[PDB]
Design a protein around this ligand. Structure first.
Ligand SMILES: *[C@@H]1O[C@H](CO)[C@@H](O[C@@H]2O[C@H](CO)[C@@H](O[C@@H]3O[C@H](CO)[C@@H](O)[C@H](O)[C@@H]3O)[C@H](O)[C@H]2NC(C)=O)[C@H](O)[C@H]1NC(C)=O
Ligand SMILES: *[C@@H]1O[C@H](CO)[C@@H](O[C@@H]2O[C@H](CO)[C@@H](O[C@@H]3O[C@H](CO)[C@@H](O)[C@H](O)[C@@H]3O)[C@H](O)[C@H]2NC(C)=O)[C@H](O)[C@H]1NC(C)=O
Ligand SMILES: *[C@@H]1O[C@H](CO)[C@@H](O[C@@H]2O[C@H](CO)[C@@H](O[C@@H]3O[C@H](CO)[C@@H](O)[C@H](O)[C@@H]3O)[C@H](O)[C@H]2NC(C)=O)[C@H](O)[C@H]1NC(C)=O
Ligand SMILES: *[C@@H]1O[C@H](CO)[C@@H](O[C@@H]2O[C@H](CO)[C@@H](O)[C@H](O)[C@H]2NC(C)=O)[C@H](O)[C@H]1NC(C)=O
Ligand SMILES: *[C@@H]1O[C@H](CO)[C@@H](O[C@@H]2O[C@H](CO)[C@@H](O)[C@H](O)[C@H]2NC(C)=O)[C@H](O)[C@H]1NC(C)=O
Ligand SMILES: *[C@@H]1O[C@H](CO)[C@@H](O[C@@H]2O[C@H](CO)[C@@H](O)[C@H](O)[C@H]2NC(C)=O)[C@H](O)[C@H]1NC(C)=O
Ligand SMILES: *[C@@H]1O[C@H](CO)[C@@H](O)[C@H](O)[C@H]1NC(C)=O
Ligand SMILES: *[C@@H]1O[C@H](CO)[C@@H](O)[C@H](O)[C@H]1NC(C)=O
Ligand SMILES: *[C@@H]1O[C@H](CO)[C@@H](O)[C@H](O)[C@H]1NC(C)=O
Ligand SMILES: *[C@@H]1O[C@H](CO)[C@@H](O)[C@H](O)[C@H]1NC(C)=O
Ligand SMILES: *[C@@H]1O[C@H](CO)[C@@H](O)[C@H](O)[C@H]1NC(C)=O
Lengths: 332, 205, 55, 239, 55
């Protein structure tokens, strides 16, 4: 009702012949959106699988244990975790790129006042191309990640087999053929090494990085696909012009049916191609979500005996932090 | 030079109507038809031969008056979409204008007839907010953790999952720790269906 | 929308343009649509004036 | 014996499993009966089966409905356009209808390949699920069922497979003081293999991670450590 | 420039109307080629993971 024909009755009446095409387009878009919703709900459910928090637990009061610094990983300091649960690491990640769901919502809210025209989201939204926010906001996902981390590190150690974090590291190192005599004396040194590695990966986003490249790649790919789809409206498709207003105001509406039909056919063909790649990327992100499913369930809450599966080499353990359109891990 | 120029017909008498600003109205522009929102601004890029401005695609986003010599920027109108939340047992509709504040809607789009409420995603209709509550599962998911339900129509934040809490200490008091060790159990068996085969189909021309 | 009974007699009808409820009702070809979030496209504003500029 | 040994992997005491034999058998039978008669009301499995059947029927109905589209011609019925025109100018209408039907067919086969790839991936998931949770129990935490998984069964289902993931689940708990590690000699510590260390009448005991059952300390339920950490309980009064 | 129109100017001039189609085709082909290259590089990287030879 807005893409092929924006606000013209002469164009909307002819759309009735291809009503099944529009119905099928809406149906496939709705089912892929439902698939995305189910995947997000599955991730939120696996984060809260067997986790158990303590009411008396206060991360703002106690934020250090066994000489390990984790303030940059735990969000919403205190028992009032209902305002903003974004931790320092998640804040830095969300500060590097601003095209998240919150950015999309703010950009669409800023379209009411005509103070800017360089933004392509307004010309995209006025043509029936909108980016709806996800079912669960990033604040909820960030709260889930910080809750899982604080529970896996503080008693009750739900995601640590009921073992403290320091003892978990000391036992995970023993699996990779090490002597237990040197691990006890090298306690402060291993704690400082862990903190240094965490700080290195924390401030490593200043220059180029693989994670930042992937996030910018998916955001830019989505924007490029939307721009290419929007650019299709400026194709003549063998007609006199690509503007419906010029054709409707230049012809007598008796011979303009062939031009309108050609433009409609071209736009529907482009729409079918776009939804085909849409289904392709939906299947790809579903498979990626499944990979995240087994990766989290086998490398965060425990350590499955799979050689070279979580990290790359003599893997110890891993952590989880919220990221835009995905998850991020610390494979020590 | 179709729909552009100076010399043209005078059969349909129409005087030089004054230009209006901040209104989504239709225009003529000496031939360049269309409808949009006119905004007043001052420019300096215009020259003697230069009297119109386009974009990379070819659309018009601004022009210079022929007689008034006043620069005007053309902005697109609003042609969005309104969502709805209809329940089976309910008899009303929870209309919601996504990313549009209802103040502008009430003064220039619609009229205040139903109890409105300005929210985060926009301005809902036929429903009041109860954000302090929490629903485990909502039949309708409006988005960004906000859902509606029928009772009548409400606005409660969506909280599908949450961790349980135990009032136990977390510090290593007395050199030991406090944990909850189970003392009784039972066997519960869930189920899951995994699709393997699909009905084969054959189509012939 | 024209609903028919077992004897070919019109029982209920939908206007499809009275309000959003009518459009949602005839969008799914059902007298009482199921609980779901239905999208109503075609929402736009209309011009309130006409400006004419000539030489 | 397979069930009795699978429960031990989830940190339980073997003393209570032997006496709780008839009770565990009745519990297993009750769980089987519950999942057997649980199809009366709505269920996730029934919803998925009805969803795939209805999706296939909907796709077939949508494809069949395409034959009633005018596609810009005078009518969508070939008989009327063939009996109304002189067959000299009807070629353009027939060509338009043919082009539209071929386009719809191409779109349908595209989604057909998409769902074929999806069901292939689902079949692969069922492949590893069966091979790792039916004939044996792979050491993958939270992979077969959801939680303290024990084992699973397999039964035929329409267009797929169905499973009964019997999972361990406690009903009541109790709070008791525990210690993850403690030294028993001159910097000669120990560590529980599966459980914790509790205090009872000035002498330590070991218990399981899922059943509150105190047991005497023995080498068969503890891991020897040559050197212990400083932040461990100092309990040198041992055997 | 060679498939739909081999070496005919009369065919190449009309191709400008569907320029976005050709651009999208080249873009998706380059994307899948890059994906294949990354997969090959990943396989070559996992083969040389912790390998150690002797001179
Ligand atoms: C809107 O802009 C136009 C474009 O500049 C203005 O027209 C200009 O008007 C001036 C004033 O008459 C003209 O200057 C004259 O030039 C002649 C030589 O040709 C000279 O003999 C006169 O004494 C006078 O200086 C100028 O040529 C003319 N430009 C054009 C392109 O026609 C117009 O006045 C502006 N209107 C308003 C309301 O600002
Ligand atoms: C939704 O309805 C509520 C009515 O309860 C409107 O008021 C909002 O109420 C919530 C709590 O019920 C406020 O949140 C917190 O309020 C305390 C003070 O009570 C403040 O110290 C906290 O920082 C936090 O803001 C909320 O502020 C309050 N809203 C306003 C504008 O004061 C609420 O306005 C309704 N929703 C919307 C979008 O209008
Ligand atoms: C008009 O058409 C509708 C749709 O075909 C008819 O609804 C159908 O009604 C029959 C019987 O009332 C339903 O059959 C059911 O079968 C199950 C299994 O045998 C049985 O357990 C039920 O008690 C019931 O008999 C059938 O499901 C239902 N169709 C749908 C889609 O739900 C309706 O009867 C027709 N009305 C007239 C006057 O022809
Ligand atoms: C043993 O436990 C004590 C707590 O009783 C630890 O002491 C504190 O550890 C935190 C962890 O970062 C530090 O921030 C505090 O400054 C420490 N306080 C004191 C008084 O030392 C101690 O570090 C633990 N030691 C080991 C080896 O785990
Ligand atoms: C909408 O966009 C405008 C334009 O960027 C924003 O206005 C800016 O606001 C910040 C802080 O309020 C100022 O520092 C800038 O100088 C403003 N820009 C200009 C050009 O003056 C506005 O904040 C945006 N609003 C929303 C809700 O995103
Ligand atoms: C919507 O209306 C239906 C119809 O009355 C309600 O279903 C009834 O629910 C009660 C409560 O258990 C049962 O005792 C009745 O037998 C049900 N009747 C039917 C016909 O199913 C349903 O609960 C209502 N839902 C809401 C959210 O109000
Ligand atoms: C004919 O043209 C002249 C000059 O343009 C104008 O004054 C007159 O009103 C026109 N008459 C009609 C009937 O359009
Ligand atoms: C309509 O909007 C314009 C600017 O957007 C504003 O000046 C005007 O007051 C609005 N209409 C009403 C009735 O308030
Ligand atoms: C979890 O959320 C539900 C509603 O979403 C609420 O009823 C329940 O009390 C919550 N559990 C808590 C707060 O422990
Ligand atoms: C924890 O809360 C429950 C219910 O509020 C109460 O019965 C119990 O005594 C509390 N325990 C402690 C240690 O506060
Ligand atoms: C566990 O609970 C069941 C019923 O809740 C009861 O029959 C059984 O005796 C309990 N077991 C113990 C050891 O108390």
């Amino acid at each position: 009702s807005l893409f092929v024909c924006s606000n013209y009755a002469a164009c909307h009446d002819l759309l009735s012949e291809y009503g099944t095409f529009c119905d099928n387009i809406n149906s496939i878009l709705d089912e892929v959106n439902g698939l995305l919703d189910t995947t997000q709900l599955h991730v939120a459910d696996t984060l809260m699988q067997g986790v158990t928090l303590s009411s008396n637990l206060n991360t703002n009061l106690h934020f250090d244990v066994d000489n390990i610094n984790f303030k940059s990983l735990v969000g919403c300091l205190g028992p009032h975790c209902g305002s903003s649960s974004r931790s320092f690491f998640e804040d830095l990640l969300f500060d590097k790129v601003k095209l998240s769901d919150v950015g999309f919502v703010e950009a669409y809210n800023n379209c009411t006042g005509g103070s800017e025209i360089r933004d392509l989201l307004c010309v995209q939204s006025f043509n029936g191309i909108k980016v709806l926010p996800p079912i669960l906001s990033e604040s909820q996902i960030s709260g889930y990640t910080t809750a899982a981390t604080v529970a896996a590190m503080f008693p009750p150690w739900s995601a640590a087999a009921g073992i403290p974090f320091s003892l978990n590291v000391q036992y995970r190192i023993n699996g990779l053929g090490v002597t237990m005599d040197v691990l006890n004396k090298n306690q402060k040194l291993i704690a400082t090494a862990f903190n240094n590695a965490l700080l290195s990966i924390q401030n490593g986003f200043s220059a180029t990085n693989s994670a930042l490249a992937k996030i910018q790649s998916v955001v830019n790919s989505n924007a490029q696909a939307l721009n290419s789809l929007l650019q299709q409206l400026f194709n003549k498709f063998g007609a006199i012009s690509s503007s419906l207003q010029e054709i409707l105001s230049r012809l007598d509406a008796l011979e303009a049916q062939v031009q309108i039909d050609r433009l409609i056919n071209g736009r529907l063909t482009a729409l079918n191609a776009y939804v085909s790649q849409q289904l392709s990327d939906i299947s790809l992100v579903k498979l990626g979500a499944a990979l995240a499913m087994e990766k989290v369930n086998e490398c965060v809450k425990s350590q499955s005996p799979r050689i070279n599966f979580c990290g790359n080499g003599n893997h110890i353990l891993s952590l989880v932090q919220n990221a835009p359109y995905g998850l991020l891990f610390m494979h020590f | 030079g179709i729909n552009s120029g100076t010399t043209c017909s005078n059969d349909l008498l129409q005087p030089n109507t004054e230009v209006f600003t901040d209104v989504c109205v239709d225009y003529d522009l000496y031939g360049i038809t269309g409808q949009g929102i006119f905004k007043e601004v001052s420019a300096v890029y215009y020259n003697s031969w230069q009297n119109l401005l386009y974009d990379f695609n070819g659309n018009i986003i601004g022009f210079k008056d022929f007689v008034t010599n006043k620069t005007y920027n053309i902005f697109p109108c609003y042609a969005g979409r309104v969502s709805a939340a209809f329940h089976q047992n309910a008899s009303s509709l929870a209309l919601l204008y996504r990313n549009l504040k209802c103040s502008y809607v009430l003064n220039n789009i619609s009229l205040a007839t139903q109890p409105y409420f300005d929210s985060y995603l926009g301005c809902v209709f036929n429903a009041d907010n109860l954000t302090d509550y929490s629903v485990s599962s909502c039949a309708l998911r409006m988005g960004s953790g906000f859902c509606v339900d029928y009772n009548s129509y409400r606005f409660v934040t969506f909280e599908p999952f949450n961790v349980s809490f135990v009032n136990d200490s977390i510090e290593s008091v007395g050199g030991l720790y406090e944990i909850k060790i189970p003392t009784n159990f039972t066997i519960v068996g869930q189920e899951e269906f995994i699709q393997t085969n699909s009905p084969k189909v054959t189509i012939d021309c | 929308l024209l609903k028919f009974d077992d004897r070919g007699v019109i029982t209920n009808a939908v206007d499809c343009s009275s309000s959003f409820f009518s459009e949602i009702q005839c969008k799914t070809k059902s007298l009482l649509p199921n609980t779901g979030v239905y999208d109503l496209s075609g929402f736009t504003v209309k011009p309130v004036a006409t400006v004419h500029r000539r030489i | 014996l397979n069930v009795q040994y699978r429960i031990n992997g989830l940190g339980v005491t073997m003393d209570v499993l032997n006496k709780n034999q008839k009770l565990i058998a009745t519990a297993f039978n009750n769980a089987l009966l519950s999942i057997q008669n649980g199809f009366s009301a709505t269920n996730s499995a029934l919803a998925k089966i009805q969803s795939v059947v209805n999706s296939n029927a909907q796709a077939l109905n949508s494809l069949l409905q395409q034959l009633f589209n005018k596609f810009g011609a005078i009518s969508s019925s070939l008989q009327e356009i063939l009996s109304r025109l002189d067959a000299l100018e009807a070629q353009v209408q027939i060509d338009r209808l043919i082009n539209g039907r071929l386009t719809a067919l191409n779109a349908y086969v595209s989604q057909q390949l998409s769902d074929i790839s999806l069901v292939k991936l689902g079949a692969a998931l069922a492949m590893e699920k069966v091979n790792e949770c039916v004939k044996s129990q792979s050491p993958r935490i939270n992979f077969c069922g959801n939680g303290n998984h024990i084992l699973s069964l397999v039964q035929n289902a329409p267009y797929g497979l169905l499973f009964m993931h019997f999972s361990y689940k406690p009903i009541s708990f109790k709070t008791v003081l525990v210690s993850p590690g403690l030294c028993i000699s001159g910097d000669v510590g120990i560590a529980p293999k599966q459980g914790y260390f509790i205090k009872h009448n000035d002498h330590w005991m070991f218990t399981g991670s899922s059943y509150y059952y105190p047991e005497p300390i023995s080498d068969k339920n503890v891991v020897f450590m040559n050197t212990c950490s400083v932040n461990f309980t100092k309990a040198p009064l041992v055997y």
